[PDB]
Ligand binder design. Sequence first.
Ligand SMILES: *S(=O)(=O)OC[C@H]1O[C@@H](n2ccc(N)nc2=O)[C@H](O)[C@@H]1OP(=O)(O)OC[C@H]1O[C@@H](n2cnc3c(N)ncnc32)[C@H](O)[C@@H]1O
Length: 177
Amino acid sequence: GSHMEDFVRQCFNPMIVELAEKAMKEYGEDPKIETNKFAAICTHLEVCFMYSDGGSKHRFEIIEGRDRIMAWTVVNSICNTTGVEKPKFLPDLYDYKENRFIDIGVTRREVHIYYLEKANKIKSEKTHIHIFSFTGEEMATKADYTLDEESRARIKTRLFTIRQEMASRSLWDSFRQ
Ligand SMILES: *S(=O)(=O)OC[C@H]1O[C@@H](n2ccc(N)nc2=O)[C@H](O)[C@@H]1OP(=O)(O)OC[C@H]1O[C@@H](n2cnc3c(N)ncnc32)[C@H](O)[C@@H]1O
């Protein structure tokens, strides 16, 4: 029974927590053991939902937060109706305005380290990458940030608030691992 686990459950909304638990069990991981991974997964989910809230009404197809099988079905429907090429790793959204997948990442290192890692890893050239850090930095493919500045600013503010809440509990150092 860890502090981090109880922190996560009071820090994130129950819908987010439930999705994160589902996602971990589906990969055979235990939220009560891998408590830093639990916190990171909830964080990534909340950022993706906040990001999809920034678009105009029908701008995005949300991929993240679905069962893995259904998430790939929807990806397949998108590729088959748009011609866009199928990503090799599951992206988080599809942008119907810019006609591209978005892979969103949240990092405790300099943004460009994780940006570069994701770039090399998906190697699916056309997929848009957008990284946020817990210190207010962001980095996106082609310097095209997709959303208006306010919708990105509120994501940065929420991430620093998560960081402060962990630090106030002496949990930030082992999370930033
Ligand atoms: S998410 O898309 O918001 O990702 C959040 C964190 O998960 C890491 N990640 C993502 C995808 C894949 N395939 N692997 C993966 O490791 C990602 O790097 C994000 O972590 P941070 O960049 O904030 O770093 C946190 C600490 O975790 C350790 N770490 C991360 N990645 C590592 C790899 N590949 N090898 C070894 N250790 C790794 C570091 O201690 C890091 O400071």
